[PDB]
Amino acid sequence: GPKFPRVKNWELGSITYDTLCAQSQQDGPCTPRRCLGSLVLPRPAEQLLSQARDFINQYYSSIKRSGSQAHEERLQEVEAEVASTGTYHLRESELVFGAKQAWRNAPRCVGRIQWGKLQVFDARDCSSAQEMFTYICNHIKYATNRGNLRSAITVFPQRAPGRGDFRIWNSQLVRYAGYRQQDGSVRGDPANVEITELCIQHGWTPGNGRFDVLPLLLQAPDEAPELFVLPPELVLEVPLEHPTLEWFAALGLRWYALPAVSNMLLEIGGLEFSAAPFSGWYMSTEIGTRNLCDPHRYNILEDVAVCMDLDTRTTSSLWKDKAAVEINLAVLHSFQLAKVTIVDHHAATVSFMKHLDNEQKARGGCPADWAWIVPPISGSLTPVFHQEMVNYILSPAFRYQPDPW
Amino acid sequence: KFPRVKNWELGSITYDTLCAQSQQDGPCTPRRCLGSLVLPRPAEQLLSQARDFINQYYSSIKRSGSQAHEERLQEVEAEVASTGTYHLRESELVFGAKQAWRNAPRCVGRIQWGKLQVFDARDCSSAQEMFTYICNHIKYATNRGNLRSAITVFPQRAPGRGDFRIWNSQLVRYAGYRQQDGSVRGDPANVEITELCIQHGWTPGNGRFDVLPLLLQAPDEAPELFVLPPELVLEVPLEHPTLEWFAALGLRWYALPAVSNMLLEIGGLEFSAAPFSGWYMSTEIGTRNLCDPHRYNILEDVAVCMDLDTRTTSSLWKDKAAVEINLAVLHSFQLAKVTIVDHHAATVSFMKHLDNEQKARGGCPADWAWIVPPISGSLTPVFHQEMVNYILSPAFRYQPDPW
Ligand code: HEM
Ligand code: HEM
Ligand SMILES: N=C(Nc1cccc(O[C@H]2CN[C@H](COc3ccc(/N=C(/N)c4cccs4)cc3)C2)c1)c1cccs1
Ligand SMILES: N=C(Nc1cccc(O[C@H]2CN[C@H](COc3ccc(/N=C(/N)c4cccs4)cc3)C2)c1)c1cccs1
Ligand SMILES: C[C@H](O)[C@H](O)[C@H]1CNc2nc(N)[nH]c(=O)c2N1
Ligand SMILES: C[C@H](O)[C@H](O)[C@H]1CNc2nc(N)[nH]c(=O)c2N1
Ligand SMILES: [Zn+2]
Known part of the structure; x- marks a missing residue:
């Protein structure tokens, strides 16, 4: 009957149709001749305006005001601003909605039952690397909250024409050192070999344990990055x-x-927040x-x-x-x-099944990357294993971005 | 533009160029991926598939382009033009069955693909004859526990008539007995086939592990019931x-x-009953x-x-x-x-297979969600291995239930 992807649960026998994928503006890596769904890396002018218009429409819907005068004035505001500056800026409440919507939109996250509960720290006033450090420490203190963790994101200034980007170089706020050996092996975490060697080239005095917490390498626009050591009592x-x-x-x-992921780009309404680290548990x-x-x-x-x-x-x-x-x-x-x-x-996976049912009623579907959602042990012992999933890209979104060096 | 295929444990990279030879569409489009879905979302037609398959055969025997080849192509051509169909030589059939198994993206056992006993049962005219062929296959494949891969291939689909079919989904299957209180005794995957058997006259048992009879069907006839002799089922x-x-x-x-409800497609021809087994x-x-x-x-x-x-x-x-x-x-x-x-x-040997296939054919179609085992995924090497999924022919396919 229905002209949308049919989605089946093979444990319970139930069927649904994803109508949300209709709302995808952005293509993924698959074609009718070949499926590239298992690949980890899926290899403006009026362009910005339409992303912006689309995002403002999403905002007005989430507050139930589509077609209103508040809605049509905001649109006019947004195009006026692009008209003369080439870019535009988000209201505080717009940024908060867009950040939650980006988490909600992320196909690889199994934690989305929690999406509506995200502390958004606005850090778009930040103007130095020292100040990023302060914001980051605040984030870690709040998020950590002596062990009772709270989901949070800190949003630093957006990308801007000509001016260089805000960037955290490390891939997570907390990362153990990876020290390459003479015998060709590695002490610590091999994943962190490169960020370790960057930290040293930039004047960090390396330890030699298996679990040395790395310093942060923080970069403010048009400046070499600077090195900051986390105070050990902040790092639980x-x-x-x-x-x-x-x-x-x-x-x-x-x-x-x-x-706490620190190297992903948060994109909202075309605006691009290149430093916007987020954490959960x-x-x-x-x-x-x-x-x-x-x-x-x-x-x-x-x-x-x-x-x-x-x-x-x-x-x-x-x-x-x-x-x-x-x-x-x-x-x-x-x-x-x-x-x-x-x-x-x-x-986790039981709560994700609930999430899927919520989103079916609320938006008529939920983008999900099966290979990532299913756990790496005991896969078919979890209910997600038996659940078909439709994967696609919606905006706002968390995206990968090239490394700064 | 061809896919880059990366292994994330070793950092090595291949390119899949074999996928360029895919002639059938999969369930995905640019807008959305549908890979975790389990079921699929004229003369010139048959003639291209036939030519292409006859070309695969002669290439494989390295007798390509020449005399035996050009004449075989004319034979197929002459037969389609007059009858709307053709027939395969035994050795072609043999090549096709092995190649269908080779090409199956969900199969983790393909390292074995060259080692397949093929029983030609195209001279089969009755359910009774299907039963005898099915018993020889079981007897051969079982081999007192030293299992040997095999396929038996029954007569192909014909425009004029209904299909040869095995109603059962495997040759060995345990009964599933639905209770009035919803619950199932035995294997809940086999409730509907258990019920079909009783309706066609079988006396049921009440165990958790009662072996089903087969429902065999010759074209346009009611299916017939056959009990497997207990000493054949190890x-x-x-x-x-x-x-x-x-x-x-x-x-x-x-x-x-031994899977017994899938369709074997070779050279545009369809084999609706072609049970296959391994281990x-x-x-x-x-x-x-x-x-x-x-x-x-x-x-x-x-x-x-x-x-x-x-x-x-x-x-x-x-x-x-x-x-x-x-x-x-x-x-x-x-x-x-x-x-x-x-x-x-198993997954270690599949890794070795991807590598053989890379050298031989320039890629390997594989379905990551099915290749990665249902416990200890990331503990096996396949978890860490990117995979490209696509349909090559010869192929095993799904087909509808005959009832
Ligand atoms: C509430 C607790 C949460 C849990 C248990 C959780 C769980 C996970 C897990 C297990 C992954 C896959 C990790 C991997 O294999 O590398 C993941 C991916 C992700 N999650 Fe969460 N999540 C949570 C909250 C969050 C929050 C607060 C955000 C952002 C606001 C977020 C956004 C993401 C994104 C963007 C990815 C995918 C990154 C990529 O594509 O490479 N999640 N989540
Ligand atoms: C030699 C030992 C073999 C092993 C260990 C093996 C292993 C497997 C496994 C585990 C699956 C997934 C099955 C499931 O989860 O239901 C599979 C799928 C499959 N294998 Fe094998 N295999 C073997 C030989 C064969 C042979 C001989 C054939 C046919 C000639 C074959 C054709 C297939 C096909 C067509 C599928 C896909 C089924 C589907 O799409 O639903 N395999 N294999
Ligand atoms: N290789 C690098 N860059 C790079 C470039 C593109 C992609 C990329 O990987 C993403 C995907 N995978 C990685 C982590 O993503 C994660 C990690 C953990 C995670 N787990 C959680 N529970 C949460 C984190 C945050 C909220 S919940 C959720 C997502 C991050 C890393 C670098 C290494 C060192 C400096 S640059
Ligand atoms: N049954 C339904 N859907 C359906 C239709 C076609 C196929 C299907 O699933 C496949 C997956 N799987 C099944 C058989 O595949 C197998 C099974 C086992 C297997 N294992 C092995 N080691 C081997 C068998 C033979 C050689 S190796 C290899 C393949 C068959 C499900 C319906 C529900 C309601 C109305 S219709
Ligand atoms: C090749 C494959 O895409 C890769 O190993 C993926 C599989 N699933 C995953 N799933 C999660 N959650 N995280 C991962 O890093 C991966 N790795
Ligand atoms: C929805 C999901 O694709 C489905 O549960 C698949 C996942 N992977 C599988 N893999 C194998 N080998 N066999 C299966 O039945 C399945 N089931
Ligand atoms: Zn796909």
Whole structure:
């Protein structure tokens, strides 16, 4: 019957039609001849005006005022401003709506049940690297909130014609050092090799531990970046122990409480906020499966299996699956004990199914990237595994952007 | 512009150029991706597919462009022009079946693709004859537990008449008996086929693991019922290497996975009954068949036996039971000496396959959501590997249920 993607849940037998994808203005990487959905990197003038008009229409709808005089004056305001300046500026309440809408729009986030609850710090008055540092520290203090984490975003000035960008160089506000060795290996987190070497080229005195917190490299328009060390008491970490395996604590493993992405671009109504770091809380599989067990990350699967006395010489003992489970349980248990917000992959995905049902009623669909939504252990044990998903790009949005160097 | 395909664990990059040869559209468009969807959203026609397939064949035997080739193309041409259809030589059929398996994007076992026993059953005129061919196939493929991949191919679709079909979705399937209180005894995926069997006269049982009969159908005839002789259906009792109470759950599974409702398309010709088999990957039995909520759904029972905290997701009880159940399956198949492959060995060998395919053909169509196992995804190398999905022919396809 309906001319929109049919979407099926194979566990419960239920069908829906996504009508929201109609609202996609921006193409993704797929064509009728080939599906490129599994690729991680999906490879103005009047152009700005129409993005702006579209965003202002979205704002007036969210407050139920489409067609009103407040609505048509705001449009006229926006084009007048572009008319003479080439760009325009967002009201405070517009920025707050657009930031939540960007989270809500993100196909790869499983945490969107929470989308309506986001503290938006407005930092569009910021004019130096020192000041960014102050805002960032404020963000971390508020978001961390002694372990009872609160979702938050801090928005720095938008991109502007000619003038250089605001940029945080690090990919997260909290990142462990990755030190390349003589023996070709790496101490710390291999993911952070490059940002580590940049920090050093820029005058940071490197440690040599597995869990050295990096300084921040902050860049204000048309200036070399500057280096700022986070005060250690601001950076809450959790030491990792296991509820029954007494030796697990002796491994000296740890992770930080606050995940906070700092290198993504927040785009709203054509405006481009190149520095707009955002934070929530972790799903446990991010730490316990990916960060600790990826072969190219900490890679601790073998060491843990040896302690558990598993047969690591044969795949069919499932030593990998057993070790990974215990690591995940340790992460959950240690966060619980420390009273630091965290969510397991079962709670997370159940809440995402609720989110999908909310959005079906509210917008008639929800863009979602199945390969990312499904957890990296125990996939089919979660209800998202059995749920078809339609992936597409809406604006406002979080986007990847080239690295500044 | 061709796709860049990156592996994120090793940082290596390929380009897929094989996809340029795709002639069929997939479910996606520029505006939206539909890859996680499970089901799909004249003479010159047949003639191009035929020419193209005959060209694939002669190329493969390196006898391309020449005499045997040009004459084979004329034969196909002469036959289509007069009859609106043609027929394949046995050795072409053999090439086509292997190539259809090779091209299947959802298949993690393709390293094996060159090793396929092909039974030509195109001289089949009755359900009875289909039954005999189906038994030889089971007997050959099972091989007392040393499983061997096989396909049996029945007579192709013809404009004039209905299809040869096997109603059952696999050759071995456990009964599912719906209760008046909604609930199911046996395998809830097989409720509708169980019911069809009874309607066509089968005496039901009441076990959790009662093996179904086959419903075989010769063209335009009511389907016919046939019982598989119990000694043809090899089964493995499930026990656990260290948990003695596990055996007592009375769980088992059959050795031979043989798909029997898909359509085999070669050279524009369609083979509506062409059952195929190989061997199981352990996660198919251990994770999906026994732990899916809408399958036998044994996760809670196992967790209670292991004495775990059921009250909370965050004890990871589900993850712990799943792992033991998969362990039980591998141990049990190893003990009965029946071919099985675990998901680590399987995905490791699929990686080697992508690499062979890259050198040979310049790409490999693969469906990431189906290749990555349903437990321990990121623990296998495939998780970390970008994959391009597209339809090449020869191919296995879905087709509608005959009832
Ligand atoms: C409330 C707690 C939250 C949880 C548990 C959560 C969970 C996640 C997870 C697990 C991922 C995938 C991570 C990975 O594999 O690298 C993700 C992606 C993402 N989330 Fe969240 N999220 C939360 C809140 C937030 C917030 C506050 C924002 C921004 C306002 C956000 C925006 C994103 C974006 C943009 C991505 C995808 C990044 C990319 O495409 O590469 N989420 N989320
Ligand atoms: C030799 C051992 C083999 C193994 C271990 C294997 C493994 C698998 C697995 C795990 C799947 C996913 C099935 C599911 O989740 O339901 C699959 C899909 C498939 N395999 Fe295999 N395979 C093997 C051999 C074969 C053979 C011999 C054929 C046919 C000649 C074949 C054709 C297929 C096809 C067509 C699919 C796709 C099914 C669909 O689209 O629904 N495979 N394979
Ligand atoms: N490689 C780099 N740049 C770069 C360029 C393009 C993309 C990119 O990756 C994104 C996707 N993946 C990465 C992280 O995204 C995440 C990470 C964690 C995450 N998890 C959470 N629970 C939350 C974070 C924030 C709110 S919830 C949610 C999203 C960030 C990194 C650099 C490394 C060092 C300096 S530049
Ligand atoms: N049944 C429905 N939808 C439907 C229709 C066609 C196909 C389908 O799913 C596929 C996926 N999967 C199924 C069989 O595929 C398999 C199964 C097992 C398998 N495993 C193996 N190891 C092998 C089998 C043979 C050689 S290796 C490899 C492939 C078949 C579902 C309907 C619901 C309501 C009205 S109609
Ligand atoms: C190749 C593949 O796209 C890549 O490994 C993806 C798979 N799914 C993922 N899912 C999440 N949430 N995060 C990731 O980094 C990835 N990696
Ligand atoms: C919606 C989703 O695509 C569906 O559940 C798929 C996911 N991946 C799968 N992968 C395999 N091998 N088998 C399956 O049945 C499925 N189910
Ligand atoms: Zn796609």
